[PDB]
Design an enzyme around this catalytic site. Structure first.
Site, short mmCIF file in Angstrom:
data_model
loop_
_atom_site.label_atom_id
_atom_site.label_comp_id
_atom_site.label_asym_id
_atom_site.label_seq_id
_atom_site.Cartn_x
_atom_site.Cartn_y
_atom_site.Cartn_z
N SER A 30 0.82 -1.22 0.00
CA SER A 30 0.00 0.00 0.00
C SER A 30 0.85 1.26 0.00
CB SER A 30 -0.93 0.04 1.21
OG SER A 30 -1.67 -1.16 1.39
N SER B 104 2.63 -7.14 1.72
CA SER B 104 1.51 -6.48 2.41
C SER B 104 0.24 -6.62 1.59
CB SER B 104 1.91 -5.10 2.84
OG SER B 104 0.95 -4.51 3.71
N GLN B 105 -0.42 -5.53 1.21
CA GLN B 105 -1.59 -5.65 0.34
C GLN B 105 -1.26 -6.45 -0.93
OE1 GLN B 105 -5.31 -3.26 -1.80
NE2 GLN B 105 -3.68 -2.06 -0.81
N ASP C 206 5.18 -8.03 13.37
CA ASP C 206 4.51 -7.30 12.31
C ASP C 206 3.01 -7.39 12.49
OD1 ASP C 206 3.68 -6.08 9.93
OD2 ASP C 206 4.64 -7.56 8.62
N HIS D 291 9.06 -4.05 6.74
CA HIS D 291 9.79 -4.12 5.45
C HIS D 291 11.30 -4.12 5.68
CE1 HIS D 291 10.69 0.30 5.05
NE2 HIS D 291 9.48 0.47 5.61
#
Length: 191
Positions: free
Chosen positions: A26, A103-104, A158, A171
């Site tokens: 994102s 992620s996304q 996370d 990250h």
């Protein structure tokens, strides 16, 4: 290297040794982003010189809002994913495909892969997911896709790995893993 379009620009008469499809996180720019994606592409290209690298772009604008939809991104985003796997199988049906997502992007890639059938799915030899926002809901895997071909990097620190939707600094650790352990896993599946 925030934008890579090696599959959309590549010629079906010069198929490579492997194709990497990657979906970014994102808010990340281009179609690879600037963290996990370029690190994985670099890692992998250091082991396999003859490779096409392709980010997931098109409708995928990596909006924060789309994380809150079922499966963790929009259907249009998933469909763009699917279109790229199909394009890989049309241009280069005998070339192995590997995929990554952060992620996304990991949600996008997991959903896309789960809906492929037959020969398009078989061509996908490995998938590495980082900061997998659907880690809880899908129990660490990709539905309808073998666990031996799947590697999930989800740090216990996370938040997204335990269901909480925020941008975390995890990250910084995943880029190390992308360049090392994940690139080796995908190399091994390709070979």
């Amino acid at each position: 290297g925030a934008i890579e379009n090696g599959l959309e620009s590549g010629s079906a008469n010069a198929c490579p040794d492997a194709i990497l499809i990657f979906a970014r996180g994102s808010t990340e720019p281009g179609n690879m982003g600037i963290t996990v994606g370029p690190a994985l592409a670099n890692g992998l290209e250091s082991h396999i010189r003859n490779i096409w690298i392709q980010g997931v772009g098109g409708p995928y604008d990596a909006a924060l809002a789309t994380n809150f939809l079922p499966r963790g991104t929009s259907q249009a985003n998933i469909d763009e994913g699917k279109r790229l796997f199909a394009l890989a199988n049309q241009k280069c049906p005998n070339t192995p495909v590997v995929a990554g997502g952060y992620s996304q992007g990991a949600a996008l890639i997991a959903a896309a892969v789960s809906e492929l059938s037959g020969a398009v799915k078989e061509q996908v030899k490995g998938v590495a997911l980082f900061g997998y926002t659907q880690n809880l809901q899908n129990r660490g895997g990709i539905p309808n896709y073998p666990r031996e071909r799947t590697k999930v990097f989800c740090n216990v620190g996370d938040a997204v790995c335990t269901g909480t939707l925020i941008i975390t600094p995890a990250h910084l650790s995943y880029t190390i893993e992308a360049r090392g352990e994940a690139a080796r896993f995908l190399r091994d599946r390709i070979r």
